[PDB]
From a paper:
The sole target for neutralizing antibodies on the virus surface is the envelope (Env) protein, a homotrimer consisting of three copies of gp120 and gp41 subunits that are associated by non-covalent interactions. Methods enabling the production of stable recombinant trimer immunogens based on the ectodomain of Env have catalyzed recent [name] vaccine efforts.
We employed a tetrahedral nanoparticle, T33_dn2, which consists of two trimeric building blocks (four copies of each), and can present four [name] trimers. For particle production, [name] [name]-[name] was combined with equimolar amounts of the assembly component ([name]) and incubated for 24 h, leading to >90% assembly efficiency. Using the approach described in the “Methods” section and Supplementary Fig. 3a, we reconstructed a 4.6 Å resolution map of the nanoparticle core and a 4.5 Å resolution map of the [name] [name] trimer. The refined model of the T33_dn2 nanoparticle core revealed a high degree of correlation with the design model predicted by Rosetta at the backbone level.
Numbering used by the authors:
A (entry chain F), C (entry chain A): 1 to 122
B (entry chain Q), D (entry chain B), E (entry chain N): 2 to 99
């Protein structure tokens, strides 16, 4: 009925837990920050990062995709999505996602390295 | 002693003795993996020998250590171009301009 | 639709985490206990305590203030609010909050020590 | 040896040799910081010398160690009063009564 | 450090601060049990405080260490007298004369 800064408190806690490697806690915290306000691309992104840290990349994909739906200029989300797709053997999507990251930032050398491998693995 | 290996690498490179330069750079790098310039030049030596896959691997490594090296970005684009990796070559070329 | 003891479970978990110094978890737990029932001055207070432990004293202030809104006789909340204001350089509020704590309990020697310093810093 | 320093402190205090008493109490306290009575008496010696800020600091410390010492509460109130800290002096005086 | 404790004892004793003197003498004695004079003065401090049983115990100890102290014999007699131990007080008084 109030809790005006709820999302902020949960978000900040999520960030602390992510930094400390406590991804399960961070997932809970980010999820809660978003649960009452699912409009923060940063939290969707960090939720994806925590999921990525966990290893369940498919969950990470959904979260990163949502971050892009809120903000398509998040090159890093594009990159990690490409990485998630790459990990799953989906080299065709890995390529598309890495290319999008590079259109946003052509100097992302890691996206280039991973794109090169995706084309070779494809 | 990596510093001496490095210098041999540069000398051999300049003289066209790329096979010598490659071994010498690898020696220097084995001892000191963070020498971005040596990685770049190693990539150039491989490029000169036609191994454009190795040239790519080393240009990328050099760039990870130093993202500002426009020449590595450019040469990365060249090696990619040689391999038919045109979208990538274009991106690397743009990265050099950026 | 049920969860009759939800707040209690979350509150108790919050207390355990506070005791163990796990303030981020404790904040989440207290927040949840209150989120579905924001009427426990003790939880507002302990939420404030966990925030105080975290160091984000401004958040601690809001939580302690709410505890006082629910129960103005919480001298300890008055004290920590005074401490939070003091930390922020607001010596004028630090004074008012410490005095209120002392009206409730004149023997709170720490509130007196901190009040003395607030008057000197003012 | 803190126990002997303590006794010297009390003797000097009673005799009006507050400067001696202060050093002696500080010696005893340096060795044993939890002696609330010595902190109280230290505060009293400072009070007697006109240093009411130090008297306050020590009365508060003595009270933290022993909140029941009505005399420390009272003397705290007196030192506060001397410094013009009247709301505080009143609170401390009430604390002594409580 | 017993020597300093001893001196504090004498000073406190002379000044009438018998409670301080008692603790100080006990400190000196704990470190050095053969100080007959300190035992005597300890007994005197107890005597002054009305504890005539302790005064007796210490006068006897002082006398065991030094049987020639007529004053301890006399004060022993006084403490005994105070306790109603008259035959004993008389003997101790005579012992002082002997």
């Amino acid at each position: 009925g109030s809790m005006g800064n709820l999302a902020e408190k949960m978000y900040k806690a999520g960030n602390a837990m992510y930094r400390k490697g406590q991804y399960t806690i961070a997932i809970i915290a980010y999820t809660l920050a978003l649960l009452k306000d699912p409009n923060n691309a940063e939290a969707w992104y960090n939720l994806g990062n925590a999921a990525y840290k966990k290893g369940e990349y498919d969950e990470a994909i959904e979260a990163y995709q949502k971050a892009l739906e809120l903000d398509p200029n998040n090159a890093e989300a594009w990159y990690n999505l490409g990485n998630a797709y790459y990990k799953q053997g989906d080299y065709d999507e890995a390529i598309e996602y890495y290319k999008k990251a590079l259109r946003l930032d052509p100097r992302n050398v890691d996206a280039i390295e991973n794109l090169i491998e995706a084309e070779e693995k494809q | 002693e990596a510093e001496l290996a490095y210098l041999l690498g540069e000398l051999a490179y300049k003289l066209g003795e790329y096979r010598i330069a490659i071994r010498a750079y690898r020696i220097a790098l084995k001892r000191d993996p963070n020498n971005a310039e040596a990685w770049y030049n190693l990539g150039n030596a491989y490029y000169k020998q036609g191994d454009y896959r190795e040239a790519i691997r080393y240009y990328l490594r050099a760039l990870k250590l130093d993202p500002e090296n426009a020449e590595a970005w450019y040469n990365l684009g060249n090696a990619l171009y040689k391999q038919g990796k045109y979208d990538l070559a274009i991106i690397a070329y743009q990265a050099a301009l950026e």
